[PDB]
Design a protein around this ligand. Structure first.
Ligand code: Q7V
Ligand code: K
Ligand code: K
Ligand code: ZN
Length: 634
């Protein structure tokens, strides 16, 4: 029922700045705020987001994560001259104070709480706050690393108290370690904290042993703190997505959070002087997109770092774009993570194996991003004739025109001479016309068509896709038969989920024979996050073809599959379901349209996880993004 996204911002938070020479804080400028908000307005994104006003965080809220002694000291900074602010700032590590910074710090915190209440009251689906100062270095009795009050720490504690939540996920993709957040929830198993960060074997600020992968949390909350230390600069999109597919997402989906909060620092993006990483601004479109199936989309993005003003504006727009549900950009050039990334991926999964099921079995210029825009109508639905269905506001039906109708006639005489059934012939007329509207017309994004004959339906859908043209087509098929899909020219990759064990010799095919049982859904999510998504992302298809046979435990997982796989091919996925299932049809259309996805809530069987790692053994040499260990030098 929730809909819309909140952009919380105020130009007042850009009215404090550094007043003395200090190279350790020159980069933290108020223009960070003004540049990103105007980039949002230039690209029409701010106008599409509900503008919730900012608040001052009350004293009682500040005390949720900070001591009275520290709050009292900061409260005295508006009365200091610059000499007294200099002396106050040198008592902390890499942070300056301003006559207005206490004022803005309360606003940055209140803005985060305004976002939390807007999302938890269902007044919006999600949102982002553009705050300054940052927060994730702030500690209970200390300002640290440009941070005065831990904004993200407030949101989790605030959401814990006023909405009695049991599970909150904090994802810190800033290039720095959010040690303030880790310290505050170290023993809290209700707030699962994840942060990747430039570590460089503890030689990069803040130079803490606790920033390493060793720190899994303390006491009752052990295994609820996950650090992924980057030990080399120049991390790429492949490293960031390997981090998601093989660490964060497996843990995040077993945790099943009731709310997601993102410490969104964009100093991890290309060209940032502080992070010195190499991920493109488009990567945050996918980091955002891959998280939105969690907690029914309840996601609050809070700004932290990001200092290259061009790199910063581009990354902000890519995040709000995916927040609004716009199609994701195709990511080209994906491959294996570097050896150093694979080394830290390896170590985190090993130490976390005591706590998380998906691991237990182990025991400077760049191009400007292409324009992103929602389709005129996102999803087109073709139910059987005479079946009227209630459809969301961005979903239509079908009206085959003369030229499309002649194409099915040409196809019939060539490959289907005996095909006389006029019901199949209408399905092929729709398949072509919606594919025509998805690929070339750009007015439609995706679509879903109910079919009668599976064999004929797949050929026309796939063959008409390749000549339109579609450089690559990923085919995801839930069924047991064989399909008219040739997988040798490197143009097609086939994912098959079946009930019969089968051997695969082609390295462009991935068959998963998952054991039938209660285990089915937990094992499917592991193969989705750890095998299907990494391969599909490296493949970079131009189109996704979903096929479901009539012979039903797909209901639980098919929604997240449809939502997550829409990160590929700019979200242009056409689904063919054999036979009419009102619930199944309404589920895919709901997921294809960009609606909220209902959550899941065990652990899989070793018979299945072994089948999956053998698939990984068989394919990771070709598809390096599958790798979760360092390759062995011969
Ligand atoms: N170029 C010199 C900066 C060095 N001082 C530490 C940076 C703290 C980072 C804060 B944040 O990016 O997490 O917001
Ligand atoms: K981080
Ligand atoms: K924790
Ligand atoms: Zn940072």
């Amino acid at each position: 029922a929730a809909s819309g996204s909140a952009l919380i911002f105020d130009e007042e938070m850009s009215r404090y700045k550094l007043l003395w020479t200090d190279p350790a804080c020159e980069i933290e400028v108020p223009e960070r705020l003004t540049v990103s908000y105007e980039a949002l307005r230039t690209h029409g994104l701010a106008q599409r987001c509900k503008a919730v006003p900012v608040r001052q965080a009350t004293e009682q809220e500040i005390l949720l994560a900070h001591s009275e002694e520290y709050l009292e000291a900061v409260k005295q900074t508006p009365g200091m001259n610059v000499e007294e602010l200099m002396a106050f700032s040198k008592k902390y590590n890499d942070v300056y104070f301003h006559q207005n910074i206490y004022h803005c710090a309360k606003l940055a915190a209140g803005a985060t709480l305004q976002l939390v209440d807007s999302v938890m009251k269902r007044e919006v689906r999600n949102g982002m706050a553009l705050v300054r100062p940052p927060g994730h270095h702030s500690q209970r009795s200390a300002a640290n690393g440009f941070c005065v009050f831990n904004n993200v720490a407030f949101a989790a504690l605030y959401a814990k108290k006023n909405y009695n939540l049991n599970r909150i996920l904090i994802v810190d993709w800033d290039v720095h370690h959010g040690q303030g957040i880790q310290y505050c929830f170290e023993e809290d198993p209700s707030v699962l904290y994840f942060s990747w960060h430039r570590y460089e074997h503890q030689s990069f600020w803040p130079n803490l042993p606790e920033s390493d992968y060793s720190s899994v949390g303390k006491g009752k909350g052990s295994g609820f703190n996950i650090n992924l230390p980057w030990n080399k600069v120049g991390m790429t999109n492949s490293d960031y997505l390997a981090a998601f597919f093989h660490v964060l997402l497996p843990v995040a989906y077993e945790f099943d959070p009731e709310l997601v909060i993102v410490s969104a620092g964009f100093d991890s993006a290309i060209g940032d002087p502080e992070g010195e990483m190499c991920a493109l601004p488009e990567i945050f479109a996918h980091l955002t997109h891959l998280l939105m199936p969690l907690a029914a989309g309840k996601m609050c993005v809070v700004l932290e770092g990001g200092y290259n003003l061009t790199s910063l504006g581009q990354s902000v727009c890519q995040t709000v774009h995916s927040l609004l549900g716009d199609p994701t950009p195709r990511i080209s050039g994906l491959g294996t993570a570097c050896d150093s990334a694979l080394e830290s991926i390896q170590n985190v999964r090993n130490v976390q194996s005591s706590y998380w099921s998906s691991f237990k079995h182990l025991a400077i210029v760049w191009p400007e991003p292409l324009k992103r825009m929602p389709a005129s109508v996102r999803t087109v639905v073709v139910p059987p004739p005479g079946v009227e269905l209630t459809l969301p506001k961005n979903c239509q039906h079908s009206d085959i025109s003369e030229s499309t109708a002649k194409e099915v006639q040409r196809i019939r005489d060539k490959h289907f001479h005996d095909l006389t059934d006029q019901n199949i012939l209408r399905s092929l007329g729709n398949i072509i016309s919606v594919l025509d509207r998805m690929m070339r017309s750009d007015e439609v994004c995706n679509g879903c068509v109910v079919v009668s004959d599976l064999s004929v339906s797949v050929q026309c859908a796939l063959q008409h896709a390749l000549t339109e043209p579609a450089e690559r087509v990923l085919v995801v098929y839930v069924g047991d038969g064989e399909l008219p899909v040739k997988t040798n020219d490197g143009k097609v990759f086939l994912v098959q989920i079946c009930t019969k064990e089968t051997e695969d010799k082609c390295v462009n095919r991935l068959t998963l024979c998952l054991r039938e049982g209660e285990s089915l859904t937990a094992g499917f999510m592991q193969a989705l996050l750890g095998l299907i998504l990494p391969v599909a992302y490296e493949f970079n298809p131009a189109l996704v073809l979903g096929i479901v046979e009539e012979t039903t435990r797909l209901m639980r997982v098919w929604g997240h599959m449809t939502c997550l796989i829409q990160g590929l091919a700019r979200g242009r996925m056409l689904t063919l379901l054999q036979g009419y299932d009102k619930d199944l049809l309404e589920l895919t259309v709901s997921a294809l349209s960009g609606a909220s996805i209902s959550p899941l809530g065990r652990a899989p069987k070793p018979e299945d996880v072994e089948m999956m790692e053998k698939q990984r053994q068989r394919l990771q040499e070709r598809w390096g993004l599958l790798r979760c260990t360092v390759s062995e030098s011969w």
